[PDB]
Design an enzyme around this catalytic site. Structure first.
Site, PDB file in Angstrom:
ATOM      1  N   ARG A 196       0.838  -1.196   0.000  1.00  0.00           N
ATOM      2  CA  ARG A 196       0.000   0.000   0.000  1.00  0.00           C
ATOM      3  C   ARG A 196       0.872   1.244   0.000  1.00  0.00           C
ATOM      4  O   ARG A 196       1.859   1.316   0.734  1.00  0.00           O
ATOM      5  CB  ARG A 196      -0.953   0.061   1.215  1.00  0.00           C
ATOM      6  CG  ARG A 196      -2.173  -0.866   1.150  1.00  0.00           C
ATOM      7  CD  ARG A 196      -3.058  -0.638  -0.081  1.00  0.00           C
ATOM      8  NE  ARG A 196      -3.663   0.695  -0.195  1.00  0.00           N
ATOM      9  CZ  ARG A 196      -4.785   1.077   0.417  1.00  0.00           C
ATOM     10  NH1 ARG A 196      -5.430   0.245   1.230  1.00  0.00           N
ATOM     11  NH2 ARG A 196      -5.258   2.303   0.224  1.00  0.00           N
ATOM     12  N   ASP A 229       5.643  -0.455  -5.998  1.00  0.00           N
ATOM     13  CA  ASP A 229       4.615  -0.714  -6.992  1.00  0.00           C
ATOM     14  C   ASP A 229       3.306  -0.022  -6.622  1.00  0.00           C
ATOM     15  O   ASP A 229       2.277  -0.264  -7.265  1.00  0.00           O
ATOM     16  CB  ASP A 229       4.413  -2.238  -7.132  1.00  0.00           C
ATOM     17  CG  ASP A 229       3.567  -2.627  -8.344  1.00  0.00           C
ATOM     18  OD1 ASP A 229       3.793  -2.101  -9.473  1.00  0.00           O
ATOM     19  OD2 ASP A 229       2.680  -3.494  -8.170  1.00  0.00           O
ATOM     20  N   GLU A 268      -1.569   7.643  -5.889  1.00  0.00           N
ATOM     21  CA  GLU A 268      -1.508   7.036  -7.219  1.00  0.00           C
ATOM     22  C   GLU A 268      -2.733   7.352  -8.076  1.00  0.00           C
ATOM     23  O   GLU A 268      -2.644   7.281  -9.306  1.00  0.00           O
ATOM     24  CB  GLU A 268      -1.294   5.508  -7.108  1.00  0.00           C
ATOM     25  CG  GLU A 268      -2.236   4.721  -6.170  1.00  0.00           C
ATOM     26  CD  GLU A 268      -1.865   3.208  -6.031  1.00  0.00           C
ATOM     27  OE1 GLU A 268      -2.541   2.341  -6.642  1.00  0.00           O
ATOM     28  OE2 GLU A 268      -0.916   2.880  -5.283  1.00  0.00           O
ATOM     29  N   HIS A 297       1.447  -0.182 -10.030  1.00  0.00           N
ATOM     30  CA  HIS A 297       0.637  -1.229  -9.408  1.00  0.00           C
ATOM     31  C   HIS A 297       0.353  -2.359 -10.397  1.00  0.00           C
ATOM     32  O   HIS A 297      -0.788  -2.635 -10.772  1.00  0.00           O
ATOM     33  CB  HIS A 297      -0.664  -0.631  -8.854  1.00  0.00           C
ATOM     34  CG  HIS A 297      -1.469  -1.578  -8.020  1.00  0.00           C
ATOM     35  ND1 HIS A 297      -0.919  -2.346  -7.015  1.00  0.00           N
ATOM     36  CD2 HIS A 297      -2.797  -1.859  -8.023  1.00  0.00           C
ATOM     37  CE1 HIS A 297      -1.870  -3.065  -6.443  1.00  0.00           C
ATOM     38  NE2 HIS A 297      -3.018  -2.790  -7.039  1.00  0.00           N
TER      39      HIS A 297
END
Lengths: 339, 339
Positions: B238, B262, B267, B299
């Site tokens: 997260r 990631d 985001e 992600h």
């Protein structure tokens, strides 16, 4: 005093760092950036030892000049020696002392890093995101256990890759080698009788054999044609195991889904040097580097802290051994009984 | 027919491909490129089901409009739902059905790909070689077994990373989790009692806890101060586990040697979208992406063939379950007893 002096050719900041760190014997080291060739050889005048790497030109005339100027021993800080004129070193009684093997963790893990890069495409994602492009279409990977792996050559490096794939991911691994390695069979890995069975069964193939007349162009049009659609091919061992022309044909058709190499047949004119702003005249190399599913790197698989420490330590120890007349047979390349 | 129709928002080529491949139920699927928000929600008029991803805006007003227009079920093709107004879904009797877990192989292996990339720097070598720069200075790696790894959170993903590191490389792994995982202790991995022991002992740290008021900014100035010099930090879990401002400070000073994520706290405005040619207004993201020892990807850890197949298949089966009144408790996110 010449007997305590090394001229190190093809010097780089990482060689300076590690040889100085490990030079606990108070040798004097003359670091030369130029490759060893007939134009630079005089920089070694009065050095009992020269230390050379894969691209240094240790030709007949170079070794003759070295000998004339007081050089008694050649320290190859590497396993290869195809540019050393061994016969001339023999005739002049100059031992050629090498580093016979690299850290098998370092090299096997670099082959794994190429697999993971071509699989999950972290380098493609990095280039996109640097351009504020957060799209991920085109980056579909595979779970490692979903593929069958073929390890061609089960020496120490291939063995270590076998273990990572089998024990780390539980993948199915198939091996090929005239000499079965007991550490590989002990973890349940099967050997096949022919290379044809590697082509037939393996989705990912990693090459770890030496280069010789039987393994040269092992990957070529004939064998590419027998491989699985979408095969991934990894080569951290020797450039000429792969016929680059044929590999390109296979990449274009889609037969080969990706190619990762840390070596290249004509690497001499390119590797370790910054050639930006000059045209790469080797078309196959230009093409391969330009393809989106290909990774070519400049023979850096051994470049870990542990592995380069061993390379430099072994080369320094080779000089210690030479000076004390206790050369190790495994490290001696040639046959320096002077004519 | 309305009760067989899905409107899929935030559509992409890979969603189209996989939902079409796996739709053996005669569903009609309307693929909408726009994110779900108050300006596009009308695209779902008459669809019994909407299928949404992490950046879709399922606000009170959006869900009310969805309901007014005939939508009975929300299919989240993901594990998260922080932009879904659960209370409004509850009040209107709309079940929110999700995919509760991604393939733990896919995500743990993506975390490993980030470690390998930051370690052996294949992406840096790829960029150099594409510029005909074959210099390797600056790409020194480490043998995997030379580092201590801390795994923070040992659910299925963290467990699979533990196994790869411990069984694949024989590395020392340390784990942290209030709930010990028997599969982790079974392979000889020790749990430590405080996060402070992770900071103290680990060279490479990978985060696999959920985000909540106790894990938010787990990585911050105070904990970074306690970490080992040159720590590598990985985060595929997260975004807001890491305080990006504090991480930047630790990258600048060299305390943190590298960072791979990631995910990212903000985001939403960026991930999955090609924003080339627009300025990234978030300075922390612009800075992080620009640094040479940082990897930020959009992600994509779940994006393997096996994992995306499960996401789409589970989402379709969720609609099968909704239509036959056999909703799986594990997949239901809300309490859709209408007011």
């Amino acid at each position: 005093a010449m007997d305590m002096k090394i001229t190190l050719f093809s010097s780089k900041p990482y060689w300076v760092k590690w040889f100085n760190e490990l030079n606990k014997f108070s040798y004097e080291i003359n670091y030369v950036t130029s490759a060893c060739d007939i134009k630079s050889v005089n920089e070694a005048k009065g050095s009992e030892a020269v230390c050379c790497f894969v691209n240094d030109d240790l030709s007949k005339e170079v070794i003759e000049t070295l000998h004339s100027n007081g050089t008694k021993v050649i320290l190859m800080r590497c396993a290869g020696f195809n540019k050393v004129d061994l016969d001339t070193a023999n005739k002049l009684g100059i031992p050629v002392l090498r580093v016979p093997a690299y850290s098998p963790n370092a090299v096997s893990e670099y082959a794994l890093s190429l697999i993971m890069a071509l699989n999950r495409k972290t380098h493609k994602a990095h280039d996109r995101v640097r351009d504020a492009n957060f799209e991920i279409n085109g980056m579909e990977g595979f779970n490692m256990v979903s593929k069958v792996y073929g390890i061609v050559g089960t020496g120490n490096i291939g063995e270590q890759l076998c273990r990572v794939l089998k024990l780390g991911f539980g993948a199915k691994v198939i091996a090929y080698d005239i000499i079965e390695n007991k550490a590989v069979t002990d973890i349940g890995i099967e050997y096949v009788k022919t290379l044809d069975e590697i082509w037939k069964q393996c989705d990912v193939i990693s090459l770890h054999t030496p280069l010789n007349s039987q393994t040269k162009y092992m990957v070529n049009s004939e064998s590419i044609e027998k491989m699985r659609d979408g095969v991934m091919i990894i080569n951290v061992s020797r450039g000429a195991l792969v016929n680059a022309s044929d590999a390109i044909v296979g990449l274009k058709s889609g037969k080969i889904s990706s190619l990762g190499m840390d070596v290249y047949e004509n690497e001499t004119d390119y590797f370790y040097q910054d050639h930006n702003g000059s045209i790469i005249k080797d078309d196959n190399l230009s093409l391969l580097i330009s393809y989106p599913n290909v990774m070519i790197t400049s023979h850096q698989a051994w470049y870990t802290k542990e592995a380069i420490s061993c390379i430099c330590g072994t080369s320094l120890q080779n000089f210690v051994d030479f000076r004390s007349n206790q050369i190790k047979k495994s490290n001696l390349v040639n046959n320096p009984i002077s004519s």
